[PDB]
Amino acid sequence: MEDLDALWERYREAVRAGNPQALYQEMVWPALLALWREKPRVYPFPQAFAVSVHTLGTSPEATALAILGAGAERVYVLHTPESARFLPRLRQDTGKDLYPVEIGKSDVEAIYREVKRLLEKHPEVPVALDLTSGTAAMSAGLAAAGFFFQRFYPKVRVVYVDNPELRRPRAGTEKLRILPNPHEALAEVDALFAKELYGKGEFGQAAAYFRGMVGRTGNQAYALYALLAEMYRAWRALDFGEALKAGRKLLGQLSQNVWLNHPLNARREALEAQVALLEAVDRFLKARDFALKEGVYGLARTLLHLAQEAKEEAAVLAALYAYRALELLLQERLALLGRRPGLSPEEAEALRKALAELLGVLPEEVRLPAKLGLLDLLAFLRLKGDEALGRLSLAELRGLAGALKGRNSALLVHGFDVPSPKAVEGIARLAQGLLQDLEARTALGPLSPEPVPLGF
């Protein structure tokens, strides 16, 4: 290599005192070609390649250096028809046999189709995609194809050959370089992945990206976003204790002064309403007293939100969520009458009567269980004059009577019913109106239903 820097000053001597190029090809080229033909190095970290793919549009020189530097045994050269005249000198200067593929100067999709094909033929080995020579469109197209296909062919790399008195760079300072894709090159991009996952309800994955953000920049503003996603993850999983824990710790940090400007403080109102809702639900889970109207509302709203998200692609699960919501809501109506349970035969016959007319059956052979079912309970609330439940017409109540009778015969409780998503809708709508009443009997802050905007 020291022969080069010696040879560079001599080329500079001979360029002074008058054909700048023809001295480079004569006294420099197979001197630089020599160095690359025995000790070629790939930056920033070296490696070899089974296969290499080159665009050819300008001149064989820099390409030939890249073919050497990649050291692959299988070489493909994508050339413009113009550039075919350079293949002999390319073959010669590299020593290798080449698979030539002709592409139009701007047939970018031809590049796309070729890379797809070559990756399919070599799906499991390192492949180098070299964009050093060609039109802007060709180099760009090959880079685009590589980074795109890296998602499915992780061993793909995108490479290019990197280069005053003379109109040229110094002949020893060329390196073969790997072009970094955007993920590996931008530290803060994981914040975009996290926000996208957040918006999809992938809260667990959003939290992991936000936590990793902290380790990649040191910026603790991302720790608060991790708590936020963890709160929603735990909440959606019905782990109310963990959600309250994380929500508390988040509200803690947003009160402190260093975080006065954090984008989440722009929605403190809705956040505080939400952490209070988790508090109420968590207390109600421990005390199990339907006198905690807030805890009942938040548990039932959460179950109904989950039922609506599962309705289409998880109907058996949605039936289960909606049954539990409707169950809690009716049980809260029973608490309004202080009876959460203890029937006088004055009622155990009157209820047998109303059930009998509702379903068009004789009172005897209506089996009134010790534990009132959904249908039993709903009818009992009308008999004892519940206002919202008395508002139902007899037709729509007869339409619900099948689904209401299936509360325990559902497949994920004790039976084998596949639900009618129309019956799942019936229960959820009935639960929805009850929930709206209970909302009027609690104070729950601003309370956006869905998660807060992240504000970036």
Place this chain on the structure above:
Amino acid sequence: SGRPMEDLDALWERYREAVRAGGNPQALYQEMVWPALLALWREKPRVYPFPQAFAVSVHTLGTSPEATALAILGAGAERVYVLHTPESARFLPRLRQDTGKDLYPVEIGKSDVEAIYREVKRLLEKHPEVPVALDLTSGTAAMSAGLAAAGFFFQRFYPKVRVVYVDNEDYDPELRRPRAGTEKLRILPNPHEALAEVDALFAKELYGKGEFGQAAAYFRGMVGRTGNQAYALYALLAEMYRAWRALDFGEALKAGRKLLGQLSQNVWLNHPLNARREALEAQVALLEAVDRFLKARDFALKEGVYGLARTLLHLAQEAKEEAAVLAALYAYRALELLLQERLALLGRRAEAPGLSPEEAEALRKALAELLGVLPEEVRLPAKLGLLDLLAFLRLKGDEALGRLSLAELRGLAGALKGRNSALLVHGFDVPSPKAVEGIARLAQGLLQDLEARTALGPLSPEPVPLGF
């Protein structure tokens, strides 16, 4: 006349002749051709494949300010950013004058690709919901690739970004330059958009992660975009698994059968899924059994019981970490089913035990000893619970339950009685995944004994590999 293609075409012919007469191309092009070419683009900006409105354009600038000036005019944006090497900063006043636009320059090293990435990130945050053109016409090969790479990556988050370049076909072997009025500003397509069948890679990736609904959407979406009906068969396979994981066994069976019916035909004799027809037939047979049992509710059909409980246990495994409350519901329903299968070997129903006073007495004593307290005081319900069922089997000599360590049982009796107190059944229990695991581990053991007593096909636990 006055920036028309007609003016330009004549000037080119005049330029054609003045170089055969030994004029120098560079200064002749800059004086003869160039001002007419610019005027054309100031009048009817030459844009393709389909004309488009950009609020922002972003241009790399390495060497020739001329093509960048055309690109700036063609994109027609209000806000223009120029990412220039330090060398090309001197071109900026000419570029501003040739385009009539007030540029915002940003200096970038000629091989600092990470700077392109950062600058595009900065500019997209500043312009988050408007059409943006990223023009790669001028720069080093690394500059152009980098801007294109940034454009396509960022499209995931900024769908209104487009990558563009000035396309220039050459006509003359005589005049090295391209023909003066044939430059067109072009959109560079995303490889995802441009390759009809790369959706198959997306589906396969989604399929191997268990995202069957989304795998099926990509397979179906491909049938339209390419007419290739081999991908409709893969959609059916993805739909089968998605219904199966959703416990929609009837729908799962419909899809499996429709898939076996296609695979049996001659057209699809070499479809890759025929390489795994034996496991497909086992799996569809399993779905048959579960569908029959769900209707019959007869525990004699061991295959249906096995299939249902295996599915429930698989769903418990997957929810065990992030969905403990759900995992418990799945595990309980599996254990309840497996216990009730045992009791059908003796001949009893859990809902209608038909106890005699001796068995009713014996069971109460049996349970009494386990709870080791208030013996003969806690009372047995009309339909036997989980512990109840366990005892009445363990009492009558159950092989799988008789092989149960009572201290391992000792630490399960709490779990074994929260079957209805679960938050998602009737009560308010948060689950200790340690409780789920015990229930799950117990039901696994029963399930394995039941597997012996069935005619199990291949039935690889996992879904069938795609074969491509």
